[PDB]
Design a binder for these strands. Structure first.
Length: 65
RNA sequence: AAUACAGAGAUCAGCAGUUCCCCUGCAUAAGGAUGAACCGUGUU
């Protein structure tokens, strides 16, 4: 199991608190720490960041859109 | 000895089996020939 096939692609991320993101996945490590670019709030469609680092503890789901 | 009789009394063919001999298989023994690019003491 690996997030390799998702690199540089757009993804949906569901956080553990049920919050939702849309972003380009650029980096990831073994603990699921993500490096993201052009992040948005799925529900809100509100631009969050041009670049952001997201802890794996926070992630519940990553989907390939 | 006399008599009564009954009174002159199977053939064609096939296959395997012993005996040597050649061809071809598998086995058991010994014998040889040659080929195979790789080297074991603090987040679930």
């Amino acid at each position: 199991a690996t997030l390799k096939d998702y690199l540089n692609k757009r993804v949906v991320i569901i956080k553990v608190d049920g919050e939702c993101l849309i972003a380009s996945l650029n980096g990831f490590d073994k603990n699921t720490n993500l490096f993201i670019t052009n992040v948005f709030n799925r529900i809100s469609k509100e631009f969050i960041c041009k670049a952001q680092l997201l802890r794996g503890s926070e992630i519940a789901l990553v989907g390939l859109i």
